[PDB]
Amino acid sequence: KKCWNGGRCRKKCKENEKPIGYCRNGKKCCVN
Of 28, 4, 7, 32, which is closest to residue 18 (Cα–Cα)?
A: 32
The residues, any chain, with a CB within 8 Å of residue 13's CB and separated by 6 or more, are: 19, 30
Q: Which long-range contacts (CB under 8 A, 24 or more apart) does 4-12 make?
A: 4/29, 4/31, 5/31, 5/32, 6/31, 6/32, 7/31, 7/32
Q: What CA–CA distance (Å, rounded) separates 4 from 32?
A: 9
* DSSP calls for 1-32: ---STT-EEESS-STT-EEES--GGG-EEEE-
The residues, any chain, with a CB within 8 Å of residue 27's CB and separated by 6 or more, are: 9, 10, 11
The residues, any chain, with a CB within 8 Å of residue 2's CB and separated by 6 or more, are: none
Burial class of residue 29 (count of CB atoms within 10 Å of its CB; 0-12, 13-18, 19+): buried
Experimental technique used to determine this entry = NMR
